[model samples]
Target: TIPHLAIDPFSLDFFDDPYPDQQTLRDAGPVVYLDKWNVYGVARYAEVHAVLNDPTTFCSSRGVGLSDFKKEKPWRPPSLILEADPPAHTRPRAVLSKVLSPATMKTIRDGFAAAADAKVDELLQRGCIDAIADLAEAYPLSVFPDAMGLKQEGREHLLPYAGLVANAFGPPNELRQTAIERSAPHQAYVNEQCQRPNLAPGGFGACIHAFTDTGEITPDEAPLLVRSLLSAGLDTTVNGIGAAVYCLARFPGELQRLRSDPTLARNAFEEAVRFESPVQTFFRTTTREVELGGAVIGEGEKVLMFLGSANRDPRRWSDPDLYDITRKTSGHVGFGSGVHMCVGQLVARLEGEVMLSALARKVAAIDIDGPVKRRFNNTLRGLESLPVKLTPA
Candidate 1:
């Protein structure tokens, strides 16, 4: 029998503090029927991992949101990589994998490192700064666009456009509406930016477009894949970097560990992704009648996976709530898993490691200086303003 509960996972209160509700969702069972949304909620680590890995049974072509593409028209053209099934998904994934490969990241490593050094130097000059605005947002805004081959101007639209896309993944609510209203200009700007003429010759966008010449993806599909990069890359990492800094500030000992050995920077970032789970929830629709967590769910039902909850599932890790940089965070679903796992993780990691390592090496202390404001969105969990005082070594 399916355990049933009335929970509004998208509510602002829930967004403000999700752990309590997430814990309730996890404790209820592996799979619980969310009556308010009429969808299944998977909060445990095992169930979420299983569901993500079994894309054939639970597909993404239908839209990885509450609004199934089969029943409702998408707000925008569905993502070629994020929203496609096999065969259609295969080519884009292969093309993107090559575009964001380890080799590509290695080639850009020095650029990211130099930027990190400059960013840290600037933050030190400011002394007390909103880490979210100065470090998190500014850092990615400076580096990622150049890596993507975007031109110098009109880059302000990326975040709002990304916020709108992330908000659209949830039920049509005020957050989505507000974002939609504010983002029309951003949408147009981003759409135009995705085109071939707007992209730099050696950037990731141009690289994805080059696949079109090899018949890997169609000419029409090229820009859509670049859109995928824009949609998935920025805000997620912005919040991710914010989450890592927040974690370090909250847990001074962990920061001390990093200060002792800056090499732990990657682990600190990875652990923060698990601890905060910036991209909190994603929905996958079932293709056929399937038994999940001892309950039979019919076809076309939406299964909401609580990535943040799963990361803290007690069954998965001892002291899952603790923020330990030394903890092994290998199987965490913060980035999602399976073929549909985050395509831009290599870039995110390179940015995170470089930025965090720079801070660890240069900063003596990272203390929360003032009120931290939470940025409320339907799908993403992160701080809007993180006032922090950084003491230089």
Candidate 2:
């Protein structure tokens, strides 16, 4: 027995602007059953954090989507890392952890910074630019693919493929249908690039394949792990870039705040993530009956953790709605929590710090020039197009 709300969290309306619904959900109770998906959702920060931390109890081995892998076939091959649990999840996580370690991050830091500065230079000349298409999308595509040592031709498949993966986490909606339609070609492209022979010597993709030499993961699992980097790494950062720009554009006072302390660029990016989390929601299936916030969620139940809502829960943060860069945001679920936390967040922070810092150095003001259009995805939230006009300092 749980409180029920007959709302579609994945519908176009909710996906467009979910804060009101999130507020309602958070206000309703700590846990409520989402009738549309027939799943229980946790909106408050405390419960969400608890569920995220207790992965053994609230497992991710069942697909983190509307369709439970135990009951239904996965749309695509399940992610070795993202859709795994405990013993099965351990080694691959270790390999990726190494691949994204401080040393690996350091290798690309200078190059990423240079690229950001160059993009900012190009933006200053334009004076007005579509931040999503021109900057956010362009910057990551420019550097990340090379960092993975992927081939130039057919590289455009990356974003759509990433979109396919993110959108798959929702129900069998029209968007998911469209994603499946467009995915085959991109999947083929990604699969080809993940092969050990196809990868270049000095990149995460190459390093992932190196795990085969160590016999850590099978040769077959290597491609899927590379697939994780390709899908997870690209889209989230693209959304993140969009979120930071949108947050800055919506709050011009904060941009002025950034102008005074350019060092706040990293902090600004993290705050933007907390303020407008890119990956909004994910699911976990309970291993056994678990009691939370005075409710007994039954075994095998799908418990939805609203990461975006938790990031804004007033209980966890003071004046949570405000987009203040000075705010301490360590506990934010913007990336996620626990061992299942996003493996690529450091890379994201580096990208954000480099890009936003470059903007702070060169730009004096930021303005929203045109209508902001949201890109509709079931699980991910971000702009399809953000028209931003900026002035050079």
Candidate 3:
């Protein structure tokens, strides 16, 4: 018999504090049927990893959200790379892979580091500031837009646009409804930025457009691909930095651990990703009837994978709840896994590495100064306002 759970995972309560219910989902069974959504869910690490890695059986082409594209019209067009299967996803993924390759990261390294250092300088002066607004949001907004060659005029729209995209991934609840109404202007501005003329030469946008010359993707397809970059990049990295800052404030020892060895910044960021899991949940549609953990999922059924819960699964981690910078977090699906892994990850990690290292070097201590508020989104988990008092080192 399949285990059934009656819980609205998309509700505000779950988003506000998810761990306790997430733990229940994990302990229920390997595969528990959510009666509320009429969908199956996998909370255990092994099963979640299996579904992500085996895309052939559990495909993305149908859609990655609650609504199946095969039946309902998507609020927007499906993503070329994120919502496509192998054959269709291949070329776009390859082109994006090239654009964001390690070599590309190397080229952009110094610029990102400079931006991070400048942001840290401001934080040190302010001493008391909201980490989410001052550091996490400011740092990425400063550098990532330039990296993508977006114009400064409409850069403010980036976060709201990405927030709507993240919220739409879950059931079309009040958040999604409100986001759709509120983000229209932001969406228009972002759409304009995706055009060729709006993108500066020698930036990520130009590089993506350059691929059109080789016919890697068609001229018409170029803008949509650029839209993919705008869609994926900002919010995820913002939340990641938010997660790291929050973790360091909550666990001062971990911050000290990072301070002791500045090189641990990379691992510290990685551990924070494991600890907070900014990109909390994603759904995959089954292409064929298949056995997952034990239960059989029928073809075209939606299976929600809890990435945040899996990262903390006791079966796979030692003291999973503890946030340790030195913890081995190699297999955490924070940025997802396998072929459909988050393409913006290289840039995200670079942002995290630079920001954390700069914080470790410049800040003596990070203390929670005031009430921290969590941003409520269906799929993303992060703070909206993290008030903190930073002592200059």
Cα lDDT tens digits, model 3, 1-393, are 679999789999898888899999999999999998899999999999999999999899999998899989988878888999999999999999999999899999999999898899888997899999888898898999999998789787888899999988988789888887766697789778888999999899999999999878988788889999998888888899999999999899999988889899998898888899988999999999999877888999999999999999999999999989999889999989999988878898899999999999999899997998888999899888999999998
| Model 1: ten consecutive residues of lowest lDDT | 175-184
Off by over 4 Å in 2: none
lDDT of 1 at 170: 91
Write candidate 1's Cα lDDT for 114-153 as tens digits: 9998999989998999999999999999899999999988
Better of 1 and 3 by lDDT: 1
In the range 69-105, model 2's lDDT, one tens digit per residue, is 9899998889999999988999999999999998888
- CA RMSD for every model? 0.9, 1.1, 1.0
Q: Can you give the lDDT of residue 184 in candidate 2?
A: 73
Could you tell me every candidate's TM-score relative to the true structure?
Answer: 0.98, 0.98, 0.98
Candidate that would win on lDDT: 1
Candidate 1 versus truth, CA RMSD in Å, comes to: 0.9
Q: CA shift at 132, candidate 2, in angstroms?
A: 0.5
Model 3 CA deviation exceeding 4 Å by range:
none
